Amino acid sequence: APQQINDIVHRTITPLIEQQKIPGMAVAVIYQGKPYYFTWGYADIAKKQPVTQQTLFELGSVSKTFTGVLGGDAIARGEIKLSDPTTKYWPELTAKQWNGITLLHLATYTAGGLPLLVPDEVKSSSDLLRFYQNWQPAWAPGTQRLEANSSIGLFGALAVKPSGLSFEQAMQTRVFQPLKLNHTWINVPPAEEKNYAWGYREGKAVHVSPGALDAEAYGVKSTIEDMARWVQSNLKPLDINEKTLQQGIQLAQSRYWQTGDMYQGLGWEMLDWPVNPDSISDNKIALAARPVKAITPPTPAVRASWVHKTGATGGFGSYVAFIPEKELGIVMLANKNYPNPARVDAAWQILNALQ
Numbered sequence: 001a002p003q004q005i006n007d008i009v010h011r012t013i014t015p016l017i018e019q020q021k022i023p024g025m026a027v028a029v030i031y032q033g034k035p036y037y038f039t040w041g042y043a044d045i046a047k048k049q050p051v052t053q054q055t056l057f058e059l060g061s062v063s064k065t066f067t068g069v070l071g072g073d074a075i076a077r078g079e080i081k082l083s084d085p086t087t088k089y090w091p092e093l094t095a096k097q098w099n100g101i102t103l104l105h106l107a108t109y110t111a112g113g114l115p116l117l118v119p120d121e122v123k124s125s126s127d128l129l130r131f132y133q134n135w136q137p138a139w140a141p142g143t144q145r146l147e148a149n150s151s152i153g154l155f156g157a158l159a160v161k162p163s164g165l166s167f168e169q170a171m172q173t174r175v176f177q178p179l180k181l182n183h184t185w186i187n188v189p190p191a192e193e194k195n196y197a198w199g200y201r202e203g204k205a206v207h208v209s210p211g212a213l214d215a216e217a218y219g220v221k222s223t224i225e226d227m228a229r230w231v232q233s234n235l236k237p238l239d240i241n242e243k244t245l246q247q248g249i250q251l252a253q254s255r256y257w258q259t260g261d262m263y264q265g266l267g268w269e270m271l272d273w274p275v276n277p278d279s280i281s282d283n284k285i286a287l288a289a290r291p292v293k294a295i296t297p298p299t300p301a302v303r304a305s306w307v308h309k310t311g312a313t314g315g316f317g318s319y320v321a322f323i324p325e326k327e328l329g330i331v332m333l334a335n336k337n338y339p340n341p342a343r344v345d346a347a348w349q350i351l352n353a354l355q
């Protein structure tokens, strides 16, 4: 890389790895549209496998950006509308609380207090219908935001219903394959297992456990090369040749709701750039309910934005940020779940120094 990039990334990430005891890390910076890669540590401590540009990391909540874009692509295809009632796509959802809950609400965590996780004792398609039928909202729809894998995960499952495809098949054919994300996976194939990093949680090697709507909310594993390509695609959607996908990326960066200085997209979250770095979590907050103000109608993707998403599984911590008006971006993938503020701090320190 150019020495300026080299030096800001290594002076920022080296002490981050130290302080947070991160076993393994990959970083990509996208600087004038062009990726630059950096790796440290181990992907598997016991087997002494290093992190490389081909290491797969669990993206956790960053997976939601893929679900938001796949949903955007389905809207652009005319298969769904965000204004549609949920019940249009799941008619057996007959319980009265669902009257007035739209796909917009599900995609943006505004349905009225759907939980962070679907309960572990929900396995089957009948178990999932009972869970949603029996769920009692705390709030009226479109009033309060509570980040929820049960919310955006249901959005993703319903958004693909009119295509006739499974969620994975729609994701593969409509998002991963057009963007040449050939080492990005909902289910890691046997051939790629040698590249799949272990996560580490209290010294113990761990992968993300199966659960209900886990592909749709937190199930994507990717490399630092494919995640750099995902940032480039989201920075510059008009270079994408597949029309509905280009439009789906644009819809995922539209501003649907405002809480404080943040704006809720489909998966992506946004602030106005330039951004105060204390204004940009899990500083160990298990549940953070916030009032939202509708942006009526949604603002199309603002190029002067800090667009980002954090992500965690038990063993992994991910972070993606980018600034369309500067052609700048960053992906940080780690095999430890370390505090969200340390992620945002390091990302800001890097990108600020490069504009």
Ligand SMILES: C=C1CS[C@H]([C@@H](C=O)NC(=O)[C@H](CCCCN)NC(=O)CC[C@@H](NC(=O)[C@H](C)NC(C)=O)C(=O)O)N=C1C(=O)O
Pocket (backbone or CB within 6 Å): 060, 061, 062, 116, 117, 147, 148, 149, 201, 206, 207, 208, 209, 210, 218, 281, 282, 285, 286, 287, 310, 311, 312, 313, 314, 315, 337
């Ligand atoms: C801020 C949010 C919004 S929703 C967001 C969301 C996206 O990243 N989180 C998840 O999907 C969470 C991650 C929780 C991190 C450690 N507690 N759940 C999962 O990924 C799946 C369940 C998870 N199950 C577990 O029992 C734990 C966390 N794993 C281990 C190894 O102990 C697993 O890894 O298999 N999590 C939070 C939160 O409060 O932790």
Ligand SMILES: [K+]
Pocket (backbone or CB within 6 Å): 211, 212, 213, 214, 215
């Ligand atoms: K599943």
